[PDB]
Amino acid sequence: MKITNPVLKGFNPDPSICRAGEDYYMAVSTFEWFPGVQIYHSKDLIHWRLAARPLQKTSQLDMKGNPDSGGVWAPCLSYADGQFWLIYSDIKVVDGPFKDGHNYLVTADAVDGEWSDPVRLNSSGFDPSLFHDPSGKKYVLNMLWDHREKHHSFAGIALQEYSVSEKKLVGERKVIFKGTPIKLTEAPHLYYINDVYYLLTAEGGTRYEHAATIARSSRIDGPYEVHPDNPILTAFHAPSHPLQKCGHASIVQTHTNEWYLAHLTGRPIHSSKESIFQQRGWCPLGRETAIQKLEWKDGWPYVVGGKEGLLEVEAPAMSVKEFSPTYHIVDEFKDSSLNRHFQTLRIPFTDQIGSVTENPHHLRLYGQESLTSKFTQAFVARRWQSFYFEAETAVSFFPKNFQQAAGLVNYYNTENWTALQVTYDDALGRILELSVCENLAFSQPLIKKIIIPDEIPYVYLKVTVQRETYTYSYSFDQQEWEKIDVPLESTHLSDDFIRGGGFFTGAFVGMQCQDTSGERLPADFKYFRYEET
Amino acid sequence: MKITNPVLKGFNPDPSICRAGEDYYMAVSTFEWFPGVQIYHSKDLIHWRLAARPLQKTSQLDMKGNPDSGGVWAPCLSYADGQFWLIYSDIKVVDGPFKDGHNYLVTADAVDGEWSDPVRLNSSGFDPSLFHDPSGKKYVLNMLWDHREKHHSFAGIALQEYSVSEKKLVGERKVIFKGTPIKLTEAPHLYYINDVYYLLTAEGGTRYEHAATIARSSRIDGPYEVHPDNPILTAFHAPSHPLQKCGHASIVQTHTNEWYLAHLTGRPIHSSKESIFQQRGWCPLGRETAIQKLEWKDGWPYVVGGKEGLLEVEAPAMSVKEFSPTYHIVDEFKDSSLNRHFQTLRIPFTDQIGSVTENPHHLRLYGQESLTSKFTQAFVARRWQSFYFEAETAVSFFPKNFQQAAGLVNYYNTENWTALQVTYDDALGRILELSVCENLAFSQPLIKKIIIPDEIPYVYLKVTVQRETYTYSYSFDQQEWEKIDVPLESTHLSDDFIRGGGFFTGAFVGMQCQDTSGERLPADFKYFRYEETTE
């Protein structure tokens, strides 16, 4: 059987792969979505289950107010000395000359167990990584961010020893590698292989110039010599390749003595009226995770099939293990916790915003701030993970003023979303309203406003996504449906469309309630269906 | 003696004036600056002292991450039933279709006492105000914010009863007033005068179309009849008038039976190459507070001297009461509390960012995030309150890497500031570097870097503000000052220059340290001089 790429579909960037015995884990970045970090598990590298989200407490991760695509950037997950180590960031500034953000370490005995509270590491640049040197010494790597006007912002790869006993970085940091002319050198990961240190980095930025670079040295602090056919992974030169933005990689040696390379990639939708060489495409599924196979020659690794990456990769010599599903196709909210594929923006799910117990078999959302707020939104959502799917909910909501609205949302960031919501109009009563926010340009295009009769206990809401286009429809009895004939562009919910310094997540679909009057009016959602078609 | 306007200079907007006996107070907005709300006190309406900053605890005001010019918008201060009542807002969203923000009520027996924990009122629009009806009932007014595409966002003035005993609004809200064609109707305040309800509002927005309008009704919920010579306050038609943006007013009747109108105003700097009618000016001192006298005719008040406002205003018949200064020209940081004119961005001053006791007679700042961060900045600052002044400090700072810098800062918001900082360069060692951030465009224009010798214990830093321009200078000895040949424009630190949805504060000058490496390297400031030199 082959590995079929991407192995993590939808928003799952910056994969950090590691091994514990015959178990394999990958951590991916989550930015402003809470809880933070997703860890997937596999026994064959083909099939991956969502196993854990470590950062569940505000003591670990406090992101209220964080900018769009701030928060948890690339993480580093490792296993050594009988425990898992997770290095993560909380980025507070994502535009301008600075990139204010802080790097932390937590540990756990199992990925789905309780994680420690964080140790502060440094703030000097993102993509922090923990390297377990064969000696037993530990080192933290990260990129150095240089704000100064006259310097490239990616000032190279810093190395500094981490003292387990002092719970701090010690000594002085050293810049061990400045990168290649591709620049934007980041994502440092160190490997010790046959008594040689290999430094893997990403270069080119995470758009279409993305690459994975590798260098090697007999000493941990260099100097490092670059791979003769560098970069080892990129699709920069190949605009028509189905995998784009190929970079930010990590390496695993399997227990079967085989070598594999996890990396992020985008799968763009193109415009037929543009050249793909000039307009490389739009990715509503964000940056996904793919796995390539490596082969070695003369002490350098090479990506099997060429540096562009393959859609179908030769799987390692392991028994196939498919996993039980981890979400309900129709979630009826029978569980005491929200299913693990649901996340909230920035803050934990508490009765500040909602409850799964107050009205049994419903998700109740207490109306809070609008979809444009970086603070407290009663919004529970899950990733688009296919170009073709339907999502559906049913909402009991009886608003009494125009500042109350609840329903079904497709969302990229606070400036980019659409929403089909039950709201209230003083002259007409309950109405069903379409709202559109495109880089903070707001529109409500329905001239024909849809009146909802008083006797309808639930309004059924649906979105049908068909690659480049998606459309809403609604029903008052879940039998006769009415299409909202406003075709919406999926590419408007993509990394490549939205403005600003942070463009790092992906499209989500979810259930939402706002009450900007102050009443905290609740909306009860009977179910949430997500069905890929 | 007359009232000389502005009575509160520099950033002091949205004045809410009230009387307690023969004491007069004004609350002004503070936006992202902490602690929140400033209350001033006067015995004669001529002289005002900074008396209190009520919102001191994160339990009352938690602004970490707030956008620039979010946070504490216009407040409402009132005195009734033996206590002070303060209505304030925490605005989370300042651009786009929404204006997410929440309104709260706190109380105190004295304005500089301990204020209560907040009661939640509503979230339906900013400028909340508490009216004490002669029936003994209480009402909250606020503007209603309408996000809907096809409606003007200022949908009128809401009114709803507040229950003291239940600690919540009760009944249902009513829209009691929709405004005039000036629109952007906000700042509602109710007054009950000669058995008539008078509703005062601001219209036209807080730029150069700002106005105060007033309307009256025999019933609290209207309909209200508009003043026949409305608006009663505005400089919209008079671009050359020295007071501009005149609006967001509040009324007080003195214990001497006289009537006054406090209002915000801007004092713009103009460009000689533009028409003042097209480019109405730039205000680095932000929105300031002025007071006018009112006179009545046929049940309507009129501003004495015309709708535009006067610089010198007839004072009430009260004994003059001057106050002595509430800051030292040269603050040597001998006190263990920061002087009341210093504020921090968004968060309280704690060991997270500094200490005035760790190194006695110095302000120590532990290097945290850059000047562009909306979270944790080790930055202690005070308002520009004069067009002409000098500010000066002396810093002990020994950075070891380029991500550590500390010094003297002039600042409007996270995207707009300049900084003269001791930093480290791997090729030169300690250097003194000038950084400039203009609507997030960043430059360091000194071609030749200024090297600091190792043996210098303190670097002396000065800014000389000269109305439309300001310049930095420095000294290693405190006796010989070296020029920094970069002219900077004061108008770039103004409400009228900066981009974005919130433009509501004013220029500050302060002491700052950043360490974006993680070491929290300390900088020690020996003193802070702020010396105004107007006249």
Tab-separated table of N, CA and C in Angstrom, chain B residues 188-281:
chain	number	residue	atom	x	y	z
B	188	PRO	N	-24.924	60.596	24.545
B	188	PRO	CA	-26.187	61.055	25.146
B	188	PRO	C	-26.026	61.351	26.633
B	189	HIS	N	-26.523	62.521	27.052
B	189	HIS	CA	-26.646	62.884	28.463
B	189	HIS	C	-28.008	63.539	28.679
B	190	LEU	N	-28.718	63.102	29.717
B	190	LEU	CA	-30.023	63.649	30.065
B	190	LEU	C	-29.898	64.602	31.242
B	191	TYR	N	-30.681	65.679	31.197
B	191	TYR	CA	-30.776	66.630	32.293
B	191	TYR	C	-32.242	66.982	32.469
B	192	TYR	N	-32.659	67.108	33.711
B	192	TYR	CA	-34.024	67.475	34.045
B	192	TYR	C	-33.974	68.893	34.604
B	193	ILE	N	-34.517	69.848	33.850
B	193	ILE	CA	-34.367	71.274	34.131
B	193	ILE	C	-35.724	71.941	33.940
B	194	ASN	N	-36.268	72.513	35.012
B	194	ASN	CA	-37.554	73.208	34.953
B	194	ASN	C	-38.631	72.298	34.369
B	195	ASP	N	-38.699	71.082	34.903
B	195	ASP	CA	-39.692	70.075	34.548
B	195	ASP	C	-39.617	69.660	33.090
B	196	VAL	N	-38.464	69.848	32.448
B	196	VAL	CA	-38.257	69.472	31.056
B	196	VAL	C	-37.028	68.574	30.984
B	197	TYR	N	-37.109	67.516	30.179
B	197	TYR	CA	-35.948	66.681	29.898
B	197	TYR	C	-35.153	67.296	28.756
B	198	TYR	N	-33.872	67.549	28.990
B	198	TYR	CA	-32.961	67.997	27.947
B	198	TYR	C	-32.003	66.851	27.640
B	199	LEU	N	-31.935	66.458	26.371
B	199	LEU	CA	-31.015	65.423	25.913
B	199	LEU	C	-29.932	66.073	25.067
B	200	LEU	N	-28.700	65.996	25.553
B	200	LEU	CA	-27.527	66.498	24.861
B	200	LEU	C	-26.852	65.344	24.137
B	201	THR	N	-26.427	65.573	22.894
B	201	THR	CA	-25.715	64.543	22.138
B	201	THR	C	-24.551	65.171	21.389
B	202	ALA	N	-23.627	64.315	20.945
B	202	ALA	CA	-22.601	64.697	19.985
B	202	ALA	C	-23.022	64.206	18.611
B	203	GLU	N	-22.715	64.990	17.588
B	203	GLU	CA	-23.005	64.591	16.223
B	203	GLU	C	-21.830	64.963	15.340
B	204	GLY	N	-21.719	64.258	14.209
B	204	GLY	CA	-20.783	64.621	13.169
B	204	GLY	C	-19.437	63.938	13.254
B	205	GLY	N	-19.232	63.088	14.255
B	205	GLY	CA	-17.961	62.429	14.453
B	205	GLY	C	-16.943	63.359	15.085
B	206	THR	N	-15.891	62.758	15.630
B	206	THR	CA	-14.958	63.511	16.451
B	206	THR	C	-13.805	64.111	15.648
B	207	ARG	N	-13.969	64.250	14.333
B	207	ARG	CA	-13.043	65.035	13.540
B	207	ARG	C	-13.635	66.426	13.368
B	208	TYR	N	-13.484	67.030	12.186
B	208	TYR	CA	-13.763	68.456	12.092
B	208	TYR	C	-15.237	68.779	11.857
B	209	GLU	N	-16.113	67.780	11.731
B	209	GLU	CA	-17.551	68.023	11.664
B	209	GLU	C	-18.238	67.897	13.027
B	210	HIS	N	-17.469	67.673	14.096
B	210	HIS	CA	-18.009	67.491	15.444
B	210	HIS	C	-18.914	68.645	15.854
B	211	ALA	N	-20.011	68.294	16.523
B	211	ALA	CA	-20.955	69.268	17.047
B	211	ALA	C	-21.574	68.711	18.326
B	212	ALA	N	-22.124	69.607	19.145
B	212	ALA	CA	-22.999	69.224	20.248
B	212	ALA	C	-24.405	69.681	19.893
B	213	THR	N	-25.357	68.759	19.905
B	213	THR	CA	-26.745	69.141	19.708
B	213	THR	C	-27.537	68.888	20.978
B	214	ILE	N	-28.632	69.625	21.111
B	214	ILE	CA	-29.472	69.494	22.285
B	214	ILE	C	-30.924	69.544	21.836
B	215	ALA	N	-31.751	68.797	22.559
B	215	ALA	CA	-33.168	68.655	22.275
B	215	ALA	C	-33.878	68.516	23.611
B	216	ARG	N	-35.181	68.789	23.621
B	216	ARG	CA	-35.914	68.789	24.877
B	216	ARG	C	-37.263	68.122	24.686
B	217	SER	N	-37.803	67.618	25.795
B	217	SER	CA	-39.088	66.926	25.816
B	217	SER	C	-39.650	66.997	27.226
B	218	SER	N	-40.974	66.989	27.322
B	218	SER	CA	-41.587	66.909	28.639
B	218	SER	C	-41.621	65.484	29.181
B	219	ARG	N	-41.396	64.479	28.334
B	219	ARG	CA	-41.363	63.077	28.737
B	219	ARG	C	-39.974	62.503	28.475
B	220	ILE	N	-39.527	61.598	29.355
B	220	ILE	CA	-38.147	61.115	29.268
B	220	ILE	C	-37.899	60.384	27.954
B	221	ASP	N	-38.912	59.708	27.418
B	221	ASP	CA	-38.740	58.917	26.210
B	221	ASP	C	-39.207	59.645	24.957
B	222	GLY	N	-39.302	60.972	25.004
B	222	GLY	CA	-39.533	61.762	23.819
B	222	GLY	C	-40.994	61.816	23.419
B	223	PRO	N	-41.282	62.251	22.176
B	223	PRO	CA	-40.307	62.706	21.173
B	223	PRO	C	-39.621	64.013	21.573
B	224	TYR	N	-38.359	64.166	21.187
B	224	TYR	CA	-37.575	65.343	21.541
B	224	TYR	C	-37.630	66.369	20.415
B	225	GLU	N	-37.711	67.641	20.797
B	225	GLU	CA	-37.696	68.762	19.868
B	225	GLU	C	-36.286	69.350	19.834
B	226	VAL	N	-35.750	69.572	18.635
B	226	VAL	CA	-34.360	70.001	18.500
B	226	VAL	C	-34.250	71.505	18.724
B	227	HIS	N	-33.118	71.918	19.290
B	227	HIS	CA	-32.809	73.324	19.510
B	227	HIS	C	-32.994	74.124	18.215
B	228	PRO	N	-33.610	75.307	18.274
B	228	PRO	CA	-33.891	76.046	17.030
B	228	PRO	C	-32.651	76.596	16.348
B	229	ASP	N	-31.550	76.770	17.068
B	229	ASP	CA	-30.288	77.220	16.491
B	229	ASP	C	-29.236	76.109	16.580
B	230	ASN	N	-29.676	74.866	16.394
B	230	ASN	CA	-28.804	73.702	16.528
B	230	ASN	C	-27.746	73.680	15.421
B	231	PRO	N	-26.537	73.184	15.714
B	231	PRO	CA	-26.044	72.731	17.016
B	231	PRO	C	-25.638	73.912	17.905
B	232	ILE	N	-25.619	73.702	19.224
B	232	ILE	CA	-25.209	74.779	20.124
B	232	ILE	C	-23.700	74.942	20.182
B	233	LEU	N	-22.944	73.933	19.762
B	233	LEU	CA	-21.490	74.003	19.764
B	233	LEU	C	-20.976	73.338	18.502
B	234	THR	N	-20.124	74.041	17.754
B	234	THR	CA	-19.424	73.466	16.606
B	234	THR	C	-18.504	74.497	15.979
B	235	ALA	N	-17.371	74.036	15.453
B	235	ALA	CA	-16.498	74.868	14.638
B	235	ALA	C	-16.422	74.365	13.201
B	236	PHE	N	-17.355	73.493	12.791
B	236	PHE	CA	-17.330	72.932	11.441
B	236	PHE	C	-17.237	74.028	10.376
B	237	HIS	N	-18.007	75.097	10.536
B	237	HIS	CA	-18.081	76.168	9.547
B	237	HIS	C	-16.927	77.156	9.648
B	238	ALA	N	-16.044	77.017	10.635
B	238	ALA	CA	-15.031	78.030	10.937
B	238	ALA	C	-13.638	77.410	11.009
B	239	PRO	N	-13.074	77.018	9.861
B	239	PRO	CA	-11.779	76.303	9.866
B	239	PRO	C	-10.638	77.052	10.524
B	240	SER	N	-10.679	78.389	10.568
B	240	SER	CA	-9.611	79.160	11.193
B	240	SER	C	-9.770	79.303	12.700
B	241	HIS	N	-10.876	78.852	13.268
B	241	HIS	CA	-11.092	79.045	14.699
B	241	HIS	C	-10.045	78.268	15.498
B	242	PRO	N	-9.531	78.833	16.597
B	242	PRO	CA	-8.448	78.161	17.340
B	242	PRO	C	-8.888	76.906	18.058
B	243	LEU	N	-10.176	76.753	18.328
B	243	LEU	CA	-10.728	75.521	18.874
B	243	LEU	C	-11.465	74.796	17.756
B	244	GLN	N	-11.145	73.519	17.558
B	244	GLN	CA	-11.771	72.708	16.524
B	244	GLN	C	-12.322	71.427	17.131
B	245	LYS	N	-13.081	70.688	16.316
B	245	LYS	CA	-13.668	69.411	16.738
B	245	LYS	C	-14.492	69.565	18.017
B	246	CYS	N	-15.250	70.657	18.115
B	246	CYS	CA	-15.917	71.012	19.367
B	246	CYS	C	-17.207	70.212	19.504
B	247	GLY	N	-17.216	69.259	20.425
B	247	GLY	CA	-18.384	68.422	20.628
B	247	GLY	C	-18.162	67.516	21.821
B	248	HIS	N	-19.037	66.515	21.950
B	248	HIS	CA	-19.050	65.573	23.071
B	248	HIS	C	-19.017	66.320	24.409
B	249	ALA	N	-20.109	67.027	24.651
B	249	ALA	CA	-20.202	67.951	25.768
B	249	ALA	C	-20.997	67.365	26.940
B	250	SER	N	-20.853	68.003	28.101
B	250	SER	CA	-21.674	67.711	29.275
B	250	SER	C	-21.938	69.030	29.990
B	251	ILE	N	-23.051	69.099	30.716
B	251	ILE	CA	-23.525	70.339	31.327
B	251	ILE	C	-23.452	70.220	32.846
B	252	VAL	N	-23.069	71.309	33.510
B	252	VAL	CA	-23.170	71.391	34.962
B	252	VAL	C	-23.846	72.711	35.328
B	253	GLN	N	-24.734	72.657	36.316
B	253	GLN	CA	-25.246	73.851	36.976
B	253	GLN	C	-24.497	73.994	38.292
B	254	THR	N	-23.844	75.138	38.487
B	254	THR	CA	-23.015	75.320	39.661
B	254	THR	C	-23.871	75.624	40.884
B	255	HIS	N	-23.253	75.491	42.057
B	255	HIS	CA	-23.905	75.902	43.298
B	255	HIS	C	-24.137	77.407	43.367
B	256	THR	N	-23.600	78.174	42.421
B	256	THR	CA	-23.883	79.595	42.305
B	256	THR	C	-24.968	79.893	41.275
B	257	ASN	N	-25.695	78.867	40.825
B	257	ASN	CA	-26.787	78.989	39.855
B	257	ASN	C	-26.306	79.499	38.499
B	258	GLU	N	-25.147	79.028	38.057
B	258	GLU	CA	-24.632	79.368	36.740
B	258	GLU	C	-24.439	78.082	35.940
B	259	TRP	N	-24.368	78.207	34.615
B	259	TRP	CA	-24.451	77.052	33.728
B	259	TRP	C	-23.222	76.972	32.834
B	260	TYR	N	-22.582	75.802	32.796
B	260	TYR	CA	-21.361	75.632	32.025
B	260	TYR	C	-21.429	74.361	31.192
B	261	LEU	N	-20.633	74.355	30.121
B	261	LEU	CA	-20.594	73.279	29.134
B	261	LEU	C	-19.140	72.854	28.948
B	262	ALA	N	-18.785	71.666	29.427
B	262	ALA	CA	-17.479	71.092	29.134
B	262	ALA	C	-17.555	70.360	27.803
B	263	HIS	N	-16.465	70.395	27.036
B	263	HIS	CA	-16.483	69.739	25.726
B	263	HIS	C	-15.061	69.385	25.321
B	264	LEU	N	-14.939	68.431	24.395
B	264	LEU	CA	-13.609	68.177	23.864
B	264	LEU	C	-13.318	69.113	22.690
B	265	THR	N	-12.027	69.274	22.391
B	265	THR	CA	-11.613	70.142	21.300
B	265	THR	C	-10.200	69.769	20.870
B	266	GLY	N	-9.892	70.012	19.598
B	266	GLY	CA	-8.535	69.883	19.095
B	266	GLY	C	-7.967	71.242	18.728
B	267	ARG	N	-6.658	71.405	18.945
B	267	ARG	CA	-5.926	72.614	18.579
B	267	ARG	C	-4.957	72.253	17.461
B	268	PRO	N	-5.342	72.412	16.204
B	268	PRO	CA	-4.543	71.854	15.108
B	268	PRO	C	-3.347	72.708	14.716
B	269	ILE	N	-2.311	72.010	14.261
B	269	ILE	CA	-1.208	72.609	13.518
B	269	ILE	C	-1.536	72.499	12.036
B	270	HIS	N	-1.372	73.589	11.296
B	270	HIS	CA	-1.727	73.602	9.880
B	270	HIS	C	-0.490	73.536	8.999
B	271	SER	N	-0.723	73.248	7.721
B	271	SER	CA	0.318	73.262	6.702
B	271	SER	C	0.192	74.527	5.863
B	272	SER	N	1.294	75.265	5.738
B	272	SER	CA	1.266	76.501	4.964
B	272	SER	C	1.026	76.258	3.478
B	273	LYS	N	1.240	75.044	2.978
B	273	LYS	CA	1.027	74.804	1.555
B	273	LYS	C	-0.355	74.245	1.233
B	274	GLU	N	-1.235	74.108	2.219
B	274	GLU	CA	-2.582	73.623	1.976
B	274	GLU	C	-3.607	74.660	2.410
B	275	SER	N	-4.800	74.563	1.827
B	275	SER	CA	-5.925	75.341	2.328
B	275	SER	C	-6.396	74.760	3.653
B	276	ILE	N	-6.544	75.632	4.652
B	276	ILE	CA	-7.106	75.223	5.927
B	276	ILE	C	-8.529	74.707	5.763
B	277	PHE	N	-9.213	75.073	4.672
B	277	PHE	CA	-10.564	74.572	4.449
B	277	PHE	C	-10.571	73.134	3.950
B	278	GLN	N	-9.470	72.673	3.360
B	278	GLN	CA	-9.383	71.312	2.843
B	278	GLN	C	-8.574	70.384	3.734
B	279	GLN	N	-7.550	70.912	4.392
B	279	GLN	CA	-6.673	70.175	5.294
B	279	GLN	C	-6.771	70.895	6.627
B	280	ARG	N	-7.718	70.464	7.465
B	280	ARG	CA	-8.105	71.214	8.656
B	280	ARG	C	-7.078	71.166	9.786
B	281	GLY	N	-6.052	70.325	9.711
B	281	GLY	CA	-4.929	70.402	10.628
B	281	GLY	C	-4.635	69.076	11.310
